[PDB]
Every structure is written in C-alpha cells, then in structure tokens.
Amino acid sequence: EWYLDFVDLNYEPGRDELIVEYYFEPNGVSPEEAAGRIASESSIGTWTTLWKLPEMAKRSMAKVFYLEKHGEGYIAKIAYPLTLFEEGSLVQLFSAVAGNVFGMKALKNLRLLDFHPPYEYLRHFKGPQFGVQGIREFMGVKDRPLTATVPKPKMGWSVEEYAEIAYELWSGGIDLLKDDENFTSFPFNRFEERVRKLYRVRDRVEAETGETKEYLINITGPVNIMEKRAEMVANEGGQYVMIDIVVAGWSALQYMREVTEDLGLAIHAHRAMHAAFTRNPRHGITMLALAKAARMIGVDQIHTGTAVGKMAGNYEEIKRINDFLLSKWEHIRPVFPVASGGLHPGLMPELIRLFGKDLVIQAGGGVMGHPDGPRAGAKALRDAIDAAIEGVDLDEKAKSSPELKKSLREVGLSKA
Amino acid sequence: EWYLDFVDLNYEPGRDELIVEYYFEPNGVSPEEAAGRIASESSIGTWTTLWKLPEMAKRSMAKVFYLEKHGEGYIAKIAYPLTLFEEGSLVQLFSAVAGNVFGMKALKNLRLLDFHPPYEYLRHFKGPQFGVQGIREFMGVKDRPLTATVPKPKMGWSVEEYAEIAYELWSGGIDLLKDDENFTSFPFNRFEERVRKLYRVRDRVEAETGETKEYLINITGPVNIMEKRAEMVANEGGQYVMIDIVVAGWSALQYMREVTEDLGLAIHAHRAMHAAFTRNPRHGITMLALAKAARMIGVDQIHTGTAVGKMAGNYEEIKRINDFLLSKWEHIRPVFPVASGGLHPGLMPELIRLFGKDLVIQAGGGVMGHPDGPRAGAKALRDAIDAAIEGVDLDEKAKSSPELKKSLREVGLSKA
Amino acid sequence: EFMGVKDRPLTATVPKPKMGWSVEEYAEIAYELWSGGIDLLKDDENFTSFPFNRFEERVRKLYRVRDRVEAETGETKEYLINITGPVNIMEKRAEMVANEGGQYVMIDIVVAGWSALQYMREVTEDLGLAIHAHRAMHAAFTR
C-alpha cells in the first residue's frame, strides 16, 4: 500500500520481463513516490491491510528500477513480471501501461516513452506479415522506394471520377493509389461498386505498362465492415488494405491482423488521430511507442514523417521511429516507413539520401500539382527518384525527362 | 485551395448539418487561416487548379462560421454538410474531425471541444440500450444510486480467491462487482473458469439477500474474444459487461453495441487510457466530446468523476459531462455517470447532494478499507447512502449502523 | 506414381541443424537440396511450428520454392512436412498443406498417439495426402 515498495533503484530485471520507460513531472510528491505510483497503478495498484492478499498479487508487482532526472522532470523505467499480462492481448498490456496511469492526480505530466517485451511476450505476436520484404516481392520493386498518391481533393469523388484519375496516376508511374484517410464509403462512391471498378482499371494498367500497381484502399469503419470489405478487396484481388489504426481502435486492429492473415492482405496504417497525444512532450504516448505496438501486431507500412520545409519534423525522432521500424527484431519482420508531408520531384534526392531506398514516398500534392496534370506528375516523381538513386543530377535527369524539367522549373516559380 | 474559402463568419448552417467546436492557437497564421485550415483538413482538404474537380467536392466542404477569441487562443465552430460522413460509422466521422487535424503544422495547440449531430446523422445510432432506465429496472433499484466495488489489490486473484471476496462484497450490500480495468484473463484466473464461478456465487447471494447483484465483468481484449466472452457472460446470465472503450478502440466498440443488442447485455465503459488527451486544455479531445461519441453508440454507464479531496475534479466540467449524459436527447436514452475517485461512507451526502440519486458510485477503497473487513464496508457505504437520501444525519445513521459508525469514526483517525 | 519415380529409391534429407531455422533460411536450403536431386524435403520430427517459423507462413513459402524447382529441373519434388501437434491442428495444418498442394504429410505416430492417427487416415483420405510416419518415441518399448 506503500508507493515506495514499488521502487528499488537497485533492482535487476531479468530477460523475462517487461520494461516500459516513462517521462514525468511530479506534482506534490517525491520523484520517487511519483514513479512509485506509476508502477502502483500500472500493476497491482494498492493495498497491504484487511482481506486475504491474493496469492500471486505479491508476484504480479511492477518495480521502478531506474529514475534518473532528465529535463524539467525525470525518466523512470519500470520493469513488469509477465503475470500481469494476458500474452497475445496487446490491448490488455495497454490497460496497465497507458491507462489510469495518465490520470493519476500526483503527476503534472506523464508520457509513455518506449517499451520492451521479453521473447516470451513478443513470441506471441506475428509481426508484419509481409514486411518490407513481402511487399517488395509482390509489387516487384527490388530497389527504389515505393511511390503513392492520395488525390486532391480528398472527397466527394464518384465511383467513376475516381477510376479516371486513378488510371492517370498509375499510368505515369505511380505504384500505389492511396485513399484518403477520411474516404471510405458514400452515397456517390459506395465501397462495393468502388472495388469492382478500380481493380479492373488497376489491371488494365498492369497490362497497358509492364509494371505493378496496387491501391491502398480504405477499409476503416466498425470491425464487421472492415472485415466484410477486406474480404472483397481480397476478392477482386488486392494484396493491400489501408486501415486508420488510431481511429479504428486497438482491439479491432488486432482482429484484423488475423483476418489479413487469412486473405493475404498487406496492412497500411494511418495514424490520422495520433496527434492527440503523440505531440505534447511532457504527456502522452510517443509516436515510437505506438509505431511499436503496432509493428508487433503486424502493419506492413506506417506514416512516420519527413525531410521537407512542409514537415520541418524532428529529424532525430523521425529517424529514431524509422530506424526502428526498419530494424531486426527476432521473428517480427521489418516495416516500411511512409513519407507523407507535401514532398515533390525535387525533394527526392535529399529525402532518400537522408532515409534509405526503403520508403514508401507519399506525395499526393507534388503530383496532382504538376502543371502538366497528374499523370506527368507521376512521371516526374518517378524520374526524380530513378535519377536520385542512380546518383544523377536532378538537372541532368531533366534534360531527358520533360515532365521532370517542367516540375523542377515550376516549383522554382513558387518559393521567393 | 484557399484556406480562406473555408471560412465565412457570417454563414448560417441548417438543421441538417454537423457542427464541431474547436479550441486552438495558431502558429504563424492568421486566426482565420488557422481555423480555415482546421476545416480544409477536416473535409475536402485542399486544391482548386488541374484535374477535373469531383462533382460533389464542391458540396462536401466544411465552413468556419464563428471564430471568436477565447483565452489565449480562440474557439472556432466549423459546420459540416452530411456528404462527408458515412452515416452510422462514427469511426469515419472521427477520421475527419479528430484526424490529421491534430497534426497540422499551423497550430500550436487544437482541442476537440464538443460536436452536434443533425437528426439525420444521429437517427442512425441506437443510443444506450438500457440507459439509466433499463439498468434501473433490472437490478431493481428505483431510487438510490448504484454501488460498486473493484477489489484491492487489483490483480493476481485466483478464480477461487475472487469468488470469496465477491461473495463478501455482494453480501454487505454491494450492487455491482466491478473488475479492474486491467484484469481480463490470466493463467490463475482464466475467463471462462471465472464466469462459471462468480455467476453462481452471484445468485447464491440474490437467494441468500432478497436484493439483486450484478458483475461489471471485463471482456476487454481483441474483438473476437470480447465477443466470445460476451456470449458467455450472456450464457450464465449477466445483464452486464465492462469494456475499456479507450483501449479497446472505436470500431471495435461499435461492433460490440450490436453484439450486446443481441445478447441483452448493458455496456459499462472505462476510460482508462483517456488521460492521454482529455487532460491538456489546449490540445486533445474533451472528456465531453468523448462521453458523447460514446453515449450515442450506446454505453449505459461511464466513469466521469467526483466531489472528494482525492479527485479535486473541476466540478464545472464534471457537472457538464454529467448533466449531458443524463439529459434527453431525442431517441438516445440517458447514460449513468460512474463516480470513481476514492469515495467512502462519509462522502455519500455531499456526493449525492452535488450529483443526483442517479449515479453509480464506485468506491473500491472505502469498502475493502473498512477496519471491520470488506463486507461491513459494503454495509457501511449502503447506509451511508440510504441515510443520505432520506435526509438523515450521518451521525444519526451511525447510531443504528455500527459498520457505518466505525467507518466514519475510523476515517476520522486518518486526516490531521 | 505421383513423384514420378518408377525405379530408384526415393531420396530425402532433414537439414542439420534440426531447429531454429527461419521461414526464410528454410526456403533457401530447401531450394538447394531439391536442386541437386533430392526427392523429399523432410522436416525434423521436432520441428512443427515456432515464433520464427510459424506453420502457416512456412507452407506458403516452401511450396512455391517446391514448384519453382520442378520448373527449374524437370523432376518432381515433395516435402514430408510436419503436421504433428494436438489433432485439431494436425487437421488444420493438413488442410493447408493440401491447399498449396502437397501430396504429403509427416506425422509422429508414436508421440501423436493412436486415436489420433486413425482419425488422420481419414482426413488424408479426404485431401489426398500420403502419410509418412516417424517412430520417434518408440525406442521406449520396441527396444
């Protein structure tokens, strides 16, 4: 019942234990009794008094085994014995470590920084199912990064209107059609009538080109539907499906891992809604924490960020989160980072050079925005990237790629 | 493509439109071009240039029709035409209004304050399914508030250990056994073996007492399981099921509405994880926003807060959020607020007097904490409440209720 | 009839070491083995399903490697894969091996148990699956 028992700065935690690192600021408590309480809460809570103490209560405790001070507050690292989790249910994990823990009156601020799972906890998660690898195999791109475009405007397109601009985009060299996070199903573009259409356009284009083309379609919605729509996307044959992991919810992603197990569907995530906590640096959940829970259940792409005036994104953090996603990790296969952030033909070389050929560059803007129309906007971006990778001067590339020249030349006429 | 078209402070929005009120602080933009962008983002995003504009793009726009300044920033109120939602999928609603909207570089802070749904959007939501009403009918309590206890410690109890203390708690007068937000299923207390047990204990106690007793059991976990466990709780007969709405996820709650439709299961929500955004007053999502999305899909109880030194909770906000939950609202039946916050026999009268007999008072502590053991702790709390309601002086009540006296007398020996 | 060998004996290899290979690592050495002239990939009696080589992800892979190799060679190639485990799973995994097309499935008859083999006869009836047995555990009495 003593938040202090929950701390011991000396303790050494074993291979088979769960560690969560926290950022906090007490608020009328010793930095010890704050960090005590974070592990009271996240595990057997309190009480040591009246009724028969539960056997295994005693072994179910959490323990602060490091609390140094950092910035205007401190970092604790609390280690957790696995009798506290239900292995497999990452959703249950969070109830203890992302719960009431953020409400507790004794803290001014509390942020979840990162967490590491003992094999024994993580060998129960399938990891991505395609990873950078699988994805890579199937579309057919061994080296460059993957290119993908959400079309502007972002809604109200009809089933028809949608095919057309899809067709254009795939046609100049885009890899991935991306729907917009918001865009699911509407009277004028119903899901079912949509799938039926695009897929056929999709193939006609493989046929037309020689290259592969996929559509990160947006199955977000109550699980039932998300399932029902996945079974259709599987039907006309897509090896992909876009899901708003933050929106959509946890329990619900899980389930969907399994479903994509089943149909052989590559998940793409879209953090649209994360900004509600992954932002404030004193409180919340680090975009990394989350890029992890979720690489573990198994998403095969996630939006992280960029290298562009538009997303002036902490390149230290952006490269942390990235490098993780891409890193080995036992059995869990590597994820693709998704470069979202108003990018365009000219930012290619620096983007790359700063984040590896292993990216899904997403640049809706720089492409719909081409002066010559979306389809030369995709030739652009394509060339802008072939030439980056092969070393070649963007100004040289331009000398053979006219939609590249005019895109370069044009993005010139916009900044003064 | 002009964040300004997205504003018009003059506009008047019709019955059949969707209004979201925001709190924000620009960050290198006019308070107009900030609030322009919040409705660029939350609806057809940008662009008015190259390819065929989508018909209905034009009618799918959002519009700031009020932006006064408030505190160190401003309040916009953006109104939304329904061609933008997929009616029914509240989860899709949030992708537009709780999305990327919190990430946009031009704001320092952005908070979702409240939202109102035109009949036409809300007539597609079932509301609670039991509401204060149904719940009230079934347990059998027409007047007092409902009492419920999570047992301390909060984990590692065995299937057995659990029955016993359950038995005790129901036995002094508790209405609701509550599991702990964290507590699902574990080697030593597996779900299935748990349900089987408690229910029988539950009834034995109805039999023993004359009163009703239920168990807000905790079906949180991936949807599949949450479903599978709901079907069992339905099986041995419970009209209740506890779910961590914030954890668990949105899409996933939805689905579960429907499932509880089916089995005739009353949902109880537990915001454990909300503190990640519902806290910071400049950024996030107001506990009210959320108490709404979720009364609408239909939870029949939610944790809000209190009137006690322990949760020194903005009584203006706590009473907002409450009063809402309890308020008429067409077709949506009223929700019960859940009073969580280390409360105990002596805070009863003031608690009440400040929040109506219509509460589910949750006080795990004040009850397990009784000096005489948990079961007289429930007599306490019971009496503490009968006497509050009937006017009677707590010191008078004590004169006939010994476990009340000794609890009053004892909570005396703790504050100096 | 099916593998295609009317006269010689059938050749088959369990790879050393016998565990901890990944879904990947496994394809590669499979590929090699089929490639010099092996008929049968054999799993090891112990080798079923593990975090780093899960069954389902395994089947999907190898089979494709299997065929690529038929294509590459001109000869047939099969994989005495190891569906041992509680019946339910053994069934569920047989239905997949059937799925990507294998006419074989390795089972530890002594381990696995009797009642359980039986049932599986019938299941392989059904999918058209050739059983291979592995007496690993018999030495407890047959000695």
Next chain:
Amino acid sequence: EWYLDFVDLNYEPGRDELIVEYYFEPNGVSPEEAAGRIASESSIGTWTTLWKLPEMAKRSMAKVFYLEKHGEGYIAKIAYPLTLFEEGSLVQLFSAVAGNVFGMKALKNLRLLDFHPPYEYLRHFKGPQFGVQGIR
C-alpha cells in the same frame, strides 16, 4: 557438432527454462559424451561445418548441467531454452525429449525421469479442470 559443447557442469539455468532429468548407461562413450548426445538429440541435434548455421540455432541449444553418477549408470539433468518448443503442444515437447533420444546407439539404457516447466511454458496448460476439488 561436438557432443561436448552440449555439456557444461557448471552452468546455471534460469527461471525460463526447461529441465528434464535423465537416467542412463553409456555404451562406448564417456558418461559425458553420452549425456552430450542426449542433449544433442533432444534439441538442435548436430552440425557446426558447411551451410549457413540458422540464426536462432545457436540460441535453440540444450545443455547438460549436472551429470552425477547414480546406481550402475548416471543421472544427467539437461536444461532447455523455450525456442525449442511450441508452447502449448506438449505433444511437440515429447518429440524432443522422449524421441529418438531412446534410440541413440551410444546408450545401453535411457529413462525419462521427471521434467520441470518454467511458468512461461506451463502457463499455457489448463491444468485439470475439476481437480480434486470440482469432482468433490
């Protein structure tokens, strides 16, 4: 590939490991190279030579960490790292520890004596369902 690497009488095995105690009689091998082989067999078998060694092969090893002599033979106790089992499938467990292990030519006799499962292996088993209790 050295049955000897599979032994170390000094080693100390952790909470999260699996121990099987054996009774045996070698038969043309040191009581060490007999008990080496019992853990070669029951885990990554053999070979350290030609093709790419599998990553986790190395961590999937078993290890004799006690072999005293007992009766006309000896008792080894081999401890096993869980990357070798498929948790839940006790049937798979036995293929490694009750397998070919009883056939190996280098032993005259081999008996499985007892085994202890680390929580982490046993928390995946439901135990009886009624026990003396329920029945009762």
